[PDB]
Amino acid sequence: SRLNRESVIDAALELLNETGIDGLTTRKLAQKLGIEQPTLYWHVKNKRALLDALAVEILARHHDYSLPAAGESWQSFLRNNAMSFRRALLRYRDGAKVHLGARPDEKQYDTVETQLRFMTENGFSLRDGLYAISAVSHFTLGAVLEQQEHTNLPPLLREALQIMDSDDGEQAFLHGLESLIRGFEVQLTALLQIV
Amino acid sequence: SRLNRESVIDAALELLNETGIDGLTTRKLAQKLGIEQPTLYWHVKNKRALLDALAVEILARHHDYSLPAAGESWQSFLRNNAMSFRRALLRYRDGAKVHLGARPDEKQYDTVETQLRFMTENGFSLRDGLYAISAVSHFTLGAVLEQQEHTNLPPLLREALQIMDSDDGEQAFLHGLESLIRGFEVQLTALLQIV
Numbered sequence: 001s002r003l004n005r006e007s008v009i010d011a012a013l014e015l016l017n018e019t020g021i022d023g024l025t026t027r028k029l030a031q032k033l034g035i036e037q038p039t040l041y042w043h044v045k046n047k048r049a050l051l052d053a054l055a056v057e058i059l060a061r062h063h064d065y066s067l068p069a070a071g072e073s074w075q076s077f078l079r080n081n082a083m084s085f086r087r088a089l090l091r092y093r094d095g096a097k098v099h100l101g102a103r104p105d106e107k108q109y110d111t112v113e114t115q116l117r118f119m120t121e122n123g124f125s126l127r128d129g130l131y132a133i134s135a136v137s138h139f140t141l142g143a144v145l146e147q148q149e150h151t152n153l154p155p156l157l158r159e160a161l162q163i164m165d166s167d168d169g170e171q172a173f174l175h176g177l178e179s180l181i182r183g184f185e186v187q188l189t190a191l192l193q194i195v
Numbered sequence: 196s197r198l199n200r201e202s203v204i205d206a207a208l209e210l211l212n213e214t215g216i217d218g219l220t221t222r223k224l225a226q227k228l229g230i231e232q233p234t235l236y237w238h239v240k241n242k243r244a245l246l247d248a249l250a251v252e253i254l255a256r257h258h259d260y261s262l263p264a265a266g267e268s269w270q271s272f273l274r275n276n277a278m279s280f281r282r283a284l285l286r287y288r289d290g291a292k293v294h295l296g297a298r299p300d301e302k303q304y305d306t307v308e309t310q311l312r313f314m315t316e317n318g319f320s321l322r323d324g325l326y327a328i329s330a331v332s333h334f335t336l337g338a339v340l341e342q343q344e345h346t347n348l349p350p351l352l353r354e355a356l357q358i359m360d361s362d363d364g365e366q367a368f369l370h371g372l373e374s375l376i377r378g379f380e381v382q383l384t385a386l387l388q389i390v
């Protein structure tokens with residue numbers, strides 16, 4: 001098949017949905033592409049190189065709300081941004097593990113920079129804006145990994161689980177997301193006051 | 196060596212700190228114990244069985260704040276509980292991945308039940324208390340995985356990272372933790388009012 005970057009990644013993602021991350025190997029990627037292992041190696045040095053690239057391509061391809069709209073609030077941008085991240089991470093099997101393992105890369109540097117600047121433009125110190133972004137990010141990754149990694153008992157526990165299972169974990173994600181955004185707001189608002 | 200449960204786990208944890216989760220195999224556990232693979236298999240059917248057990252033993256051994264103190268608030272219990280979880284997950288290499296992969300097990304059912312009941316006793320609906328517990332849990336896991344899985348650029352990004360690196364990610368963890376607890380409080384407090 002074609003072994004340009006885009007084609008190698010198409011096939012690696014397609015494989016990831018077949019095998020998950022633990023089973024994704026270069027050997028199996030080579031078979032999928034109908035090529036010998038040493039041909040693939042010209043293109044893809046190892047699995048870590050492969051994963052590094054998938055993590056970025058997944059976000060470039062499906063993470064539509066990297067940047068805020070003109071006039072958008074930081075409440076609404078962190079909302080939309082976190083929702084876009086969750087969806088892009090769920091679109092591929094072990095998506096959040098492929099994300100976790102990778103390097104916030106040169107090509108996304110300007111995305112994350114814009115975000116840190118955006119947050120500083122609406123009244124966050126750098127410090128408190130990076131904490132806001134890292135918490136959203138850590139909350140969203142953790143919920144998505146649980147959703148993905150789950151792939152007689154006491155009553156509350158029985159009912160709680162039954163309820164978590166009702167939907168994908170989206171209601172529990174969006175609820176905690178609102179708590180997190182408001183917590184940030186209550187902090188930002190108070191300034192030097194004891195809160 | 197001894198192949199009682201406690202001894203098998205001691206050696207598996209010791210191995211996990213040597214290899215991490217990806218390198219932990221039953222074959223290597225057998226070598227570490229000085230036993231043949233089929234002797235180990237009598238004791239430990241596979242890696243998934245092994246991981247299931249480590250995840251639980253890690254919490255039984257080092258997660259000291261499963262349950263709240265007499266008189267403690269739900270703000271302070273979720274604080275202490277999340278801090279105990281983070282520490283227990285960091286005590287072993289890829290601790291959060293060993294946690295993620297496992298089954299909230301019969302032996303911890305009563306711990307998590309007590310917690311769901313505790314939260315309902317201080318004015319949460321079951322629904323809103325499970326969302327509170329799952330968000331703490333998802334936030335803490337995600338921060339711990341990032342801390343663990345991280346194992347020239349634009350300025351804000353440069354300074355932000357420099358700052359994240361200053362400590363282990365504990366300041367960013369404890370800051371987001373306070374936002375999350377307050378977000379919950381603002382929700383719980385309002386009742387039927389628009390907030």
Ligand SMILES: CN(C)c1ccc(O)c2c1C[C@H]1C[C@H]3[C@H](N(C)C)C(O)=C(C(N)=O)C(=O)[C@@]3(O)C(O)=C1C2=O
Pocket residue numbers: 059063065066081082085104108111112115130131133134136137138341352355356359
């Ligand atoms: C530098 N900054 C404070 C941190 C701290 C800890 C982290 O674990 C991370 C960042 C940058 C953030 C930006 C977040 C952003 N958002 C809050 C989800 C985000 O939208 C993107 C993005 N490329 O669009 C990420 O790279 C991102 O998912 C990400 O992977 C990050 C990340 O992994």
Ligand SMILES: CN(C)c1ccc(O)c2c1C[C@H]1C[C@H]3[C@H](N(C)C)C(O)=C(C(N)=O)C(=O)[C@@]3(O)C(O)=C1C2=O
Pocket residue numbers: 146157160161164254258260261276277280299303306307310325326328329331332333
């Ligand atoms: C049932 N409940 C709402 C959920 C939902 C999603 C989850 O991803 C989980 C739970 C139970 C929670 C309890 C939390 C608790 N805490 C909020 C951190 C906790 O202290 C424990 C514990 N055994 O002490 C967990 O099992 C726990 O870490 C855990 O692993 C959970 C977990 O994985």
Ligand SMILES: [Cl-]
Pocket residue numbers: 001002
């Ligand atoms: Cl072709």
Ligand SMILES: [Cl-]
Pocket residue numbers: 001002003004
């Ligand atoms: Cl080609």
Ligand SMILES: [Cl-]
Pocket residue numbers: 004005006007
């Ligand atoms: Cl290309």
Ligand SMILES: [Cl-]
Pocket residue numbers: 024025026027046047
């Ligand atoms: Cl491989």
Ligand SMILES: [Cl-]
Pocket residue numbers: 196197
């Ligand atoms: Cl002995």
Ligand SMILES: [Cl-]
Pocket residue numbers: 196197198199
């Ligand atoms: Cl023995």
Ligand SMILES: [Cl-]
Pocket residue numbers: 199200201202
């Ligand atoms: Cl024993």
Ligand SMILES: [Cl-]
Pocket residue numbers: 219220221222241242
């Ligand atoms: Cl194995």
Ligand SMILES: [Mg+2]
Pocket residue numbers: 099104137
């Ligand atoms: Mg990331």
Ligand SMILES: [Mg+2]
Pocket residue numbers: 294299332
């Ligand atoms: Mg858990």
